[PDB]
Design a binder for this molecule. Sequence first.
Ligand SMILES: *Cc1ccc(-n2ccnc2-c2ccccc2C)cc1Br
Ligand SMILES: *Cc1ccc(-n2ccnc2-c2ccccc2C)cc1Br
Lengths: 230, 230, 8, 8
Amino acid sequence: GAMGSMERASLIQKAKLAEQAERYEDMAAFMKGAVEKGEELSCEERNLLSVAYKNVVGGQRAAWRVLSSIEQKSNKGPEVREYREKVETELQGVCDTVLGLLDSHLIKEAGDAESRVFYLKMKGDYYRYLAEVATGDDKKRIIDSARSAYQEAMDISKKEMPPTNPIRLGLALNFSVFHYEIANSPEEAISLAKTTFDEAMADLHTLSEDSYKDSTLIMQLLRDNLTLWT
Amino acid sequence: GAMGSMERASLIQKAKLAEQAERYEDMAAFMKGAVEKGEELSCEERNLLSVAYKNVVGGQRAAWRVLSSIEQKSNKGPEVREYREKVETELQGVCDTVLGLLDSHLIKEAGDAESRVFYLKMKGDYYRYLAEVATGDDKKRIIDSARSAYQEAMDISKKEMPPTNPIRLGLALNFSVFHYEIANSPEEAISLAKTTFDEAMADLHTLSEDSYKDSTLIMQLLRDNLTLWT
Amino acid sequence: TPSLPTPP
Amino acid sequence: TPSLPTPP
Ligand SMILES: *Cc1ccc(-n2ccnc2-c2ccccc2C)cc1Br
Ligand SMILES: *Cc1ccc(-n2ccnc2-c2ccccc2C)cc1Br
């Protein structure tokens, strides 16, 4: 696309600059360009991709929730619905773009557990965002697509990664949020967060100080959700 | 343009929704559409226009300053300069759009002091933003364009508005910042802020509680700058 | 230096 | 409920 003329390394450099400048739409466009070069992503590059799109979709989701709340209080003319729909369509477009990158061809080339779990977690997350706004014939299929991606990620992570691995912990956190917020399964959410926390706690003794900091940060986020939910 | 099909009132309604959703690019596009309907703007509508574009250009300016700082520390390949230039060009485009709205035809139809001063202040501000990034043959002309717009605004405001009027106070604040930051005239900046503050203080006795709150807020911002500068 | 912010 | 934030 529009980034086809730019060197891969230059796209990555500019993504880092865009992050420092808080230009997340630019960051996402640079990272989309980098993915489309066709090469696998390193760990650092995967994180750049994730940060970029999380910020973009995060802004859209926040706007959608503001507008949806106004719309539900209205229930005036068609403007609130129209503008909510505009934001919704834009959000869906970004999710479809991310899912498209994962399907063409990041997941299929990802053979190491760390990369494959990372991408499948992403796939779950972006289907989850589609689920948040879905109301038509395919809504159950969207929810099931999220579930399936998260479940494959969980199965790989349990076999191949320590219980303290940050990607494994973040996956469990997000899958637990899926259960609570999307699948109407609060008990499953709570069980997953609890078991994840406990298994991580038991493995902290193996870690360096720096790895300990990372794992315990995500453990605290699990605990925070457990507190909110109980 | 793209908003030509939408009712003026719907554009204004959606601008307000976009503000609540913190969708400032959308807000600006809606307000550009509203201006292009050809009718004069009310006070509330002028403020919507201003808020929208201030947020948009504010983000661009902040990004430009981050990138410019990295570039000056670099003085590696062309990427930092290229990306700074990209952000700069986008910023210039937004400023040119705002200036275009003012010239076609908001200023020429603005006959009341409140509207005319508001628009001329805007004109000064957006030339000031162009001045912040200017380096070529026209840089002195850009600075003079800002100065001229601010000066016409000041002359009208002094004749037609009380010294406590928020638009008059905001104009003086921004013109003082022009003097300090752009025109290399810190003494003029300080004198303007001081005289503005003092003349406003003397007129506070005439105001209602609500008007007092508004005027004193801007007076405090003048005082804050005086503290920074002395 | 800070210029005028958006209204409160 | 909060999901995973961006990394610190
Ligand atoms: C340039 C300018 C000046 C004043 C306002 N304004 C209008 C109503 N309230 C305010 C305001 C804005 C910022 C700080 C304080 C106050 C009272 C709007 C613009 Br644009
Ligand atoms: C999904 C996920 C999980 C973990 C990370 N990550 C990688 C390095 N640090 C972290 C992180 C992220 C958020 C909070 C805490 C920590 C330690 C990135 C992603 Br994407």
